[PDB]
């Protein structure tokens, strides 16, 4: 679809068999989801934002479906204020900015 930005670009995603709402975030290098139980191994990582850095759990090669489009890649889980879909997965679903 084509998504205007008068409202937050929130979409439904499916990860680990569960549905959630997430923000398509072109300003995010990586995809960061709120605390949740994902299967598989993970490694600790740190990522920084406007307010500073947080500790996250890095899950690699995770299947995630974003508004009906499948992606497989890195998903970070931690105390983000909002579930964000970042460029690492936006590229996989073929997302571009247009004006």
Ligand X SMILES: CCOP(=O)(COc1ccc(C[C@H](NC(=O)O[C@H]2CO[C@H]3OCC[C@H]32)[C@H](O)CN(CC(CC)CC)S(=O)(=O)c2ccc(OC)cc2)cc1)OCC
Spatial distance between the Cα atoms of 97 and 99, rounded to a whole number of angstroms: 7
The residues that touch its own copies, with contacts defined as CB under 8 A, are 1-6, 8-9, 23-29, 32, 47-54, 67, 69, 80-81, 84, 87, 90-91, 93-99
Count of positions on this chain that bind ligand X (CB under 6 A): 18
List 50, 61, 97, 99, residue binding ligand X (CB under 6 A): 50
CB of 53 to ligand X, least distance (A): 6
Backbone angles phi, psi at 90, to 5 degrees: -60, -40
What distance in Å separates the CA atoms of residue 79 and residue 40, rounded to the nearest whole number?
Answer: 19
Burial label for 74, CB within 10 Å (0-12, 13-18, 19+), is middle
CA distance 93 to 31: 13
Residue 30: active-site member? no
Apex CA 91: angle with CA 67 and CA 23, to 5°? 45
Smallest gap from Cβ 43 to its own copies, in A, equals 19
Return the residue of 11, 13, 30, 59 that touches ligand X, per CB under 6 A. 30
Which spans of this chain sit near ligand X (rule: CB under 6 A)?
Answer: 23, 25, 27-30, 32, 47-50, 52-53, 80-82, 84, 86
């Amino acid at each position: 679809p084509q998504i205007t930005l008068w409202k937050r670009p929130l979409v439904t995603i499916k990860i680990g068999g569960q549905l959630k709402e997430a923000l398509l975030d072109t300003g995010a290098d990586d995809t960061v989801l709120e605390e949740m139980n994902l299967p598989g191994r993970w490694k600790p990582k740190m990522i920084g934002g406007i307010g500073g850095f947080i500790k996250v759990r890095q899950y690699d090669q995770i299947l995630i479906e974003i508004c009906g489009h499948k992606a497989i890649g890195t998903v970070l889980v931690g105390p983000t204020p909002v579930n964000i879909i970042g460029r690492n997965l936006l590229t996989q679903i073929g997302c571009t900015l247009n004006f």
